[PDB]
């Protein structure tokens, strides 16, 4: 019974949370993960995502100089009052590299406006891009109104959606993501520390992502850590107290690594099975997957994992196209199927 135990989830002193495996996408634990809440500074994670996608597409470089306009003037717009700021002033010429550290490490609000105008021409156009990615990522419970998360009564997100944005940052724009573990940067002779305190936690290998607090929102944290190549992402929103700011998320992450492991049983292009084909230039079709398979399973069980498959149709008939789905791979633990993945043709089979 110890081999098949399902571990109890620790109590988390927060309104909402989720813990997922970055590679497999598996939800390890969750509570109220789809509830719409104020994201506060977590919004800047999407701001960073857009900037990263622009850079990935070569629209601008880190050494490019950005001229600060009136709207990014920190003390020119009281909307910034009480918030994190770089103290940008109009006419300043600042490299993208400093601005994006301002956003990522410091959650600098004036820096968000500065990059928004630089990357998209206006704040409104940039928010349009943010929501366009909200749609592309298929988030069902997120909407943005500002490039910083201030002054946005109708913005919202959820623990699940914020973890998925976290996953996308890491996955799609790794060069942008790699900036998040930097503990400090220096601007106008003033040293600024990464506001994500978990970075200093020595028991874990935390390298992101974003912490946030509003009296409205309570404590918000999206974190990610690795043990080897294994990576978990946690999102904890509406954290109730100051003291659990980092602690509640730390409980989740460490629990996740203690009880679960991620395995990669099959890679793209590797033959999983072979089946006869009729009417083709070859006698057999090579079958596998079109995306590396990552699974999340109880730690210790890797040698117990079994795999098998079924076919959608009695016979395979050419023409067969590359990545055509022809069945399903069943991954099993203790006689029970735990994960399914599409079985596909690995090399196209034209008619003879």
């Amino acid at each position: 019974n110890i081999k098949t135990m399902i571990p109890g989830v620790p109590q988390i002193d927060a309104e909402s949370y989720i813990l997922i495996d970055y590679n497999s996408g598996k939800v390890l634990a969750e509570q109220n993960a789809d509830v719409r809440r104020d994201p506060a500074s977590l919004t800047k994670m999407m701001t960073s995502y857009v900037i990263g996608q622009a850079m990935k597409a070569g629209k601008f470089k880190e050494t490019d100089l950005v001229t600060i306009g009136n709207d990014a003037w920190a003390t020119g717009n009281p909307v910034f009052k009480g918030s994190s700021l770089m103290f940008l002033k109009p006419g300043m010429q600042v490299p993208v590299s400093q601005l994006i550290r301002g956003i990522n490490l410091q959650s600098g609000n004036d820096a968000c406006v500065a990059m928004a105008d630089f990357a998209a021409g206006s704040q409104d156009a940039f928010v349009g891009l943010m929501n366009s990615y909200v749609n592309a990522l298929g988030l069902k419970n997120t909407h943005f109104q500002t490039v910083h998360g201030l002054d946005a009564d109708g913005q919202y997100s959820s623990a699940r959606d914020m973890a998925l944005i976290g996953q996308a940052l890491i996955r799609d724009v790794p060069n942008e993501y790699s900036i998040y573990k930097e503990k400090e940067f220096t601007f106008n002779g003033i040293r600024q520390l990464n506001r994500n305190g978990l970075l200093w936690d020595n028991s874990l290998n935390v390298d992101g992502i974003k912490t946030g607090h509003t009296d409205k929102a309570g404590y918000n944290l999206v974190a990610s850590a690795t043990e080897g190549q294994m990576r978990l992402i946690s999102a904890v929103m509406g954290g109730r107290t100051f003291k659990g700011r980092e602690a509640e998320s730390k409980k989740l992450l460490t629990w996740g690594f203690r009880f679960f492991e991620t395995v990669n049983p099959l890679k793209v292009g590797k033959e999983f099975a072979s089946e006869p084909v009729w009417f083709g230039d070859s006698d057999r079709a090579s079958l596998g997957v079109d995306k590396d398979v990552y699974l999340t399973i109880p730690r210790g069980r890797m040698k117990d994992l079994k795999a098998s498959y079924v076919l959608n149709s009695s016979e395979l008939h050419a023409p067969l196209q590359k990545n055509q789905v022809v069945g399903t791979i069943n991954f099993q633990l203790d006689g029970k199927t735990i994960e399914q993945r599409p079985l596909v043709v690995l090399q196209e089979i034209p008619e003879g």
Side-chain angles (χ1 to χ4, degrees):
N1 302 77
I2 202 53
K3 273 277 263 193
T4 64
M5 63 173 213
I6 173 186
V9 188
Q11 203 72 260
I12 310 285
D13 195 16
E15 302 269 273
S16 294
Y17 71 75
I18 192 160
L19 206 218
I20 66 168
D21 182 292
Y22 162 82
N23 287 114
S24 69
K26 186 77 149 178
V27 180
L28 295 190
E30 64 177 302
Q31 181 191 98
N32 297 326
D34 300 299
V35 171
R36 294 195 180 171
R37 299 192 71 267
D38 180 8
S41 264
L42 301 203
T43 282
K44 289 178 187 64
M45 283 181 65
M46 179 60 85
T47 296
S48 172
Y49 186 80
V50 180
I51 287 157
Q53 287 283 21
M55 298 187 65
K56 179 160 145 154
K59 296 183 169 181
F60 50 88
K61 321 163 78 169
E62 126 188 42
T63 43
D64 292 339
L65 297 78
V66 179
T67 297
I68 305 310
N70 199 76
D71 297 336
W73 173 19
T75 57
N77 319 253
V79 59
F80 292 132
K81 181 171 66 173
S83 73
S84 175
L85 301 165
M86 295 180 69
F87 294 82
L88 265 25
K89 310 181 173 189
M92 286 194 162
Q93 296 188 4
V94 186
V96 168
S97 64
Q98 306 222 82
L99 293 182
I100 65 171
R101 276 163 179 81
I103 299 173
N104 301 346
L105 271 60
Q106 181 178 355
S107 291
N109 294 287
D110 50 351
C112 291
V113 174
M115 290 302 306
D117 279 344
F118 185 73
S122 74
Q123 290 179 64
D124 279 351
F126 187 102
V127 163
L129 294 179
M130 293 161 82
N131 289 323
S132 282
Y133 284 116
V134 157
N135 293 331
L137 294 170
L139 316 174
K140 309 205 212 349
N141 288 295
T142 298
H143 175 67
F144 299 112
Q145 303 189 313
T146 60
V147 314
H148 38 47
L150 302 179
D151 205 17
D153 293 345
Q155 71 171 359
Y156 57 79
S157 195
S158 68
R160 186 192 314 281
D161 289 13
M162 275 299 156
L164 286 162
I165 289 174
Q167 169 179 61
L169 273 162
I170 297 170
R171 195 222 298 121
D172 304 330
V173 294
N175 295 328
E176 174 77 10
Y177 182 69
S178 81
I179 291 165
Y180 288 83
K181 53 177 169 164
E182 290 174 30
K183 306 195 215 292
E184 67 187 357
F185 88 117
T186 285
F187 183 67
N188 230 346
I190 304 198
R191 270 52 181 329
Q192 299 275 351
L193 286 191
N194 191 320
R195 307 293 187 90
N196 175 9
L198 270 183
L199 290 174
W200 284 256
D201 191 325
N202 237 248
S203 76
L204 289 161
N205 295 305
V206 172
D207 61 16
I209 310 187
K210 181 108 304 193
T211 193
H213 172 285
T214 275
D215 278 328
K216 301 298 158 61
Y219 298 86
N220 282 0
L221 176 61
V222 170
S224 186
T226 52
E227 199 146 275
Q229 335 69 336
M230 188 183 157
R231 180 183 285 281
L232 292 184
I233 302 178
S234 60
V236 169
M237 299 185 68
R240 280 170 196 126
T241 84
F242 180 81
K243 346 300 157 334
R245 222 146 77 260
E246 301 167 17
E248 299 298 303
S249 286
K250 179 181 178 196
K251 283 185 201 170
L252 269 174
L253 293 175
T254 71
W255 172 84
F257 287 120
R258 182 157 82 262
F259 297 102
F260 304 92
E261 84 184 282
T262 290
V263 295
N264 168 215
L266 184 68
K267 21 213 87 187
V268 157
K270 159 78 169 184
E271 179 176 304
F272 178 72
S274 177
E275 294 286 344
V277 207
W278 297 92
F279 317 114
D281 79 349
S282 315
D283 310 8
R284 298 181 71 92
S286 191
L287 278 28
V289 299
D290 46 20
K291 191 189 214 203
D292 300 276
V293 171
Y294 289 99
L295 271 21
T296 292
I297 75 193
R299 177 166 296 273
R301 306 300 309 277
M302 179 204 331
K303 298 62 158 212
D304 291 24
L305 189 78
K306 305 303 177 57
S308 67
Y309 71 96
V310 294
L311 303 168
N312 290 349
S313 316
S314 185
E315 293 170 6
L316 290 183
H317 295 354
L320 290 185
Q321 292 177 14
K322 189 174 175 171
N323 295 345
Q324 185 171 326
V325 313
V326 289
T328 294
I329 306 184
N330 290 143
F331 295 91
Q332 308 212 313
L333 208 41
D334 302 321
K336 193 61 171 156
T337 284
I338 57 162
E339 297 290 342
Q340 295 192 121
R341 302 292 185 265
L343 180 62
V344 310
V345 171
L346 292 176
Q347 292 167 281
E348 95 184 292
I349 314 289
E351 299 203 55

